[PDB]
Symmetry: C3
Subunit: 113 residues, 3 copies
Amino acid sequence: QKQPISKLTRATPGSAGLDLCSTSHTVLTPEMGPQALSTGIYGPLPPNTFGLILGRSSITMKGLQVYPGVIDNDYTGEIKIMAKAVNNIVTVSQGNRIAQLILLPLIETDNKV
Amino acid sequence: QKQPISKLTRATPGSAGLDLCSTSHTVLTPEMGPQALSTGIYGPLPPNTFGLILGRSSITMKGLQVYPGVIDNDYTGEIKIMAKAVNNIVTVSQGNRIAQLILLPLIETDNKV
Amino acid sequence: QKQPISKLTRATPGSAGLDLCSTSHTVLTPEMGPQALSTGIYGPLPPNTFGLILGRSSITMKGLQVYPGVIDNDYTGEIKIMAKAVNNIVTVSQGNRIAQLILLPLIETDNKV
Ligand SMILES: O=c1ccn([C@H]2C[C@H](O)[C@@H](COP(=O)(O)O)O2)c(=O)[nH]1
Ligand SMILES: O=c1ccn([C@H]2C[C@H](O)[C@@H](COP(=O)(O)O)O2)c(=O)[nH]1
Ligand SMILES: O=c1ccn([C@H]2C[C@H](O)[C@@H](COP(=O)(O)O)O2)c(=O)[nH]1
């Protein structure tokens, strides 16, 4: 876009996740293995939070696996969805909502950096 | 059931997850792709929390993949486990503990709803 | 090791995850299904936290799936990474960073234990 994370929207007031759509039309087959789908949405995240990319249930049930992804607080690049056709040929259309971004507290530890 | 989430139990005091068993006997093959397993347990969740469904390690190691699922705070339907046989035929018996529900803080943002 | 979790390091100040490497050389094929990779790193976790094991994006994109794993607060054994070659033969070398440990708040409920 570059579009910030503040332009994502959430389905309902109770929704845990911010919806992420692909900006591309993409056809995916099982033998293709993981593919990085474009979102046009960019990091970074609110202070003291990090992000988790997870699939939507309807999409997962339709045979498209989204691999859990961690977005770091200070990531400033494009948020991509890591996706794979499980059994069937899977077609993603431009603007389909394919994943969700969940925001979570970033816990501070003394681990060396 | 309908059974609320307050009837789930946790393995040990330190357990992060609430145990979820299937209420059905189900046989799963790899070529079947994702299947939604019944739990008889229903949303909604404590205030300002959302839920994450994840597999148990022993089950995952036995060849049954549970796909991460997001339960929204205000979801009032039945919590299903999205499961797939990875390589082998997998048999689930009634009342086997197949997944776990982890509760997490729901972070409020200004994103449009 | 036995090495505590306090010896893990994080890539950048903003990194959500603590890096986990395999201590073994391991070759993984798709027909092998899930394998538990050794880390030499042991629980337990900071008070009132639990742990989530997730893959790294580059590794996932290279065809190695890490299955999400839950580390309980009071787990005192070795943290293993549950991994599977998706399509291709995957080779893991000693000390490759293959996964990440994310720490999360442990929410207290009244569920029976
Ligand atoms: O599903 C994902 C996973 C990661 N990333 C970006 C954000 C992360 O901050 C960065 C580095 O990822 P890791 O290799 O640390 O997981 O890659 C994504 O866009 N999507
Ligand atoms: O593994 C899952 C994922 C989702 N849901 C229910 C709860 C969610 O609030 C609802 C909508 O899911 P999403 O499509 O937003 O992920 O479906 C489940 O029961 N199990
Ligand atoms: O990916 C994983 C998942 C689990 N465990 C260990 C830590 C958990 O506390 C313990 C029991 O796991 P569950 O069966 O409750 O998920 O196994 C791991 O080392 N790695």
